[PDB]
């Protein structure tokens, strides 16, 4: 069956070179048309350009002429996009697709290759803890929590009480802030009468940076 | 360079007809290029859904059908259906090489599939060990809201604070409602020098604000 198949995210400092790759089967690679395609964060779809795997004839969209190179590998029918040089806003995801001929539309369609260029350097998280509340929670329960801090790059493992504790708990994702450091909460909700009783303690591990912590999560009293 | 403007969100319930309009030019739409339409499921490869203005290709229900006068066309799902939840594309061309394939900014289909759920929101003011660390963050976290669709708006006393506010896209959580934080960071001193500091999360037309203050 007619199939792209793209290679998976990538994750680059402004500066460096990349390349990615759309590998085709179930047909006959040669004679088609293929594109790559580019959606920028919260954007459309933009052409950037084509190529015939036959000869490799190539026409690019004039915003990415010398910004990119396309190229094509019969023997193992795969197209590729290539940067020389990354800048931050390349960041984006970046589809595979096969023209149709005469029409100017596309009939398959890759996945979709997340690029993402960043300065961002691996980091640990800071945890810091979100003190028991009572106010938006239940009768008879609280919340408290741990708050994890400027850490690269996803993802953190939080558990609680050494993964005893289990319901519950609520992980927030992560966002990610101008900085480039990724930063998430997670909450549980525990009987208000277990506060004075019971320690919480939520385990944070990032393996990027080899950080692991174990934080005490205590009224304020 | 040039772009069809679709609209960024349609949603309806499940059976009704829903329809995605697709903005073009003079240059591509109004010039006399044809529409394509492209459907994409969470996660998946674009799927050719229309070519040719209203021509369906096989595997696609004639559920959709598309259109197209002057410089516009558009895209009409009958029977919505759950598998219809998705972003959709118009693509089209124009005369110019930029123009080769001119693509639609995208339009995602919500299906409504279940009540609307109200958002629960708890709000964290600093821990004072993130003040001796120089730094301070309010945290407003919102939970078991449907459908998956917030605003957050951080106010400094009465005023409204747009600097150093993040806040996530919401993301389904194990009961199928969502879930979505918002993130206020300010310097300690900024912390300490007004009286108080609000979140205010707008759902569906109604807004809950909640209201923390350094004197705590």
């Known amino acids: 069956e007619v199939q792209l198949v793209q290679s998976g995210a990538e994750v680059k400092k402004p500066g460096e070179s990349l390349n990615i790759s759309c590998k085709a089967s179930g047909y006959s690679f040669t004679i088609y048309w293929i594109a790559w395609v580019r959606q920028l964060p919260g954007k459309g779809l933009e052409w950037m350009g084509i190529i015939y795997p036959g000869d490799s004839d190539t026409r690019y969209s004039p915003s990415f002429q010398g910004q990119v190179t396309i190229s094509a590998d019969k023997s193992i029918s795969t197209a590729y996009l290539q940067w020389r040089s990354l800048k931050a806003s390349d960041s984006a995801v970046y589809y595979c697709?096969?023209?149709?001929?005469?029409?100017?539309?596309?009939?398959?369609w890759g996945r979709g290759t997340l690029v993402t260029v960043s300065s961002a350097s691996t980091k640990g998280p800071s945890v810091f803890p979100l003190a028991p509340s009572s106010k938006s929670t239940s009768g008879g329960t609280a919340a408290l929590g741990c708050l994890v801090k400027d850490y690269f790059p996803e993802p953190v493992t939080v558990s609680w009480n050494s993964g005893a504790l289990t319901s519950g708990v609520h992980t927030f994702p992560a966002v990610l802030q101008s900085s480039g450091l990724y930063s998430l909460s997670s909450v549980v909700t525990v009987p208000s009468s277990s506060l004075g009783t019971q320690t919480y303690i939520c385990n944070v591990n990032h393996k990027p940076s080899n950080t692991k912590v174990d934080k005490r999560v205590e009224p304020k009293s | 360079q040039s772009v069809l403007t679709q609209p960024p969100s349609v949603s309806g319930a499940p059976g009704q007809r829903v329809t995605i309009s697709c903005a073009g030019s003079?240059?591509?739409?109004?010039?006399?290029?044809?529409v394509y339409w492209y459907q994409q499921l969470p996660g998946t490869a674009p799927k050719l859904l229309i070519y040719?203005?209203?021509n369906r290709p096989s595997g696609v229900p004639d559920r959709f059908s598309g259109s197209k006068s002057g410089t516009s066309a558009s895209l009409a799902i009958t029977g919505l259906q759950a598998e219809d939840e998705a972003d959709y594309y118009c693509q089209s061309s124009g005369s110019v090489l930029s123009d080769l394939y001119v693509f639609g900014t995208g339009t995602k289909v919500t299906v409504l599939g279940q009540p609307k759920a109200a958002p629960s929101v708890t709000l964290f003011p600093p821990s004072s060990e993130e003040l001796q660390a120089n730094k301070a963050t309010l945290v407003c976290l919102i939970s078991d809201f449907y459908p998956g669709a917030v605003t957050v708006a951080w106010k400094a006393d009465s005023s409204p604070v747009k600097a150093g506010v993040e806040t996530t896209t919401p993301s389904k959580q194990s009961n199928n409602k969502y879930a979505a934080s918002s993130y206020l960071s300010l310097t300690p001193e900024q912390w300490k020098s007004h009286r108080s500091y609000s979140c205010q999360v707008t759902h569906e037309g109604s807004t809950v604000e909640k209201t923390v203050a350094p004197t705590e």
């Open positions: 040719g203005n209203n």
């Open positions: 697709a096969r023209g149709v001929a005469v029409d100017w539309y596309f009939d398959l």
């Open positions: 003079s240059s591509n739409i109004g010039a006399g290029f044809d």
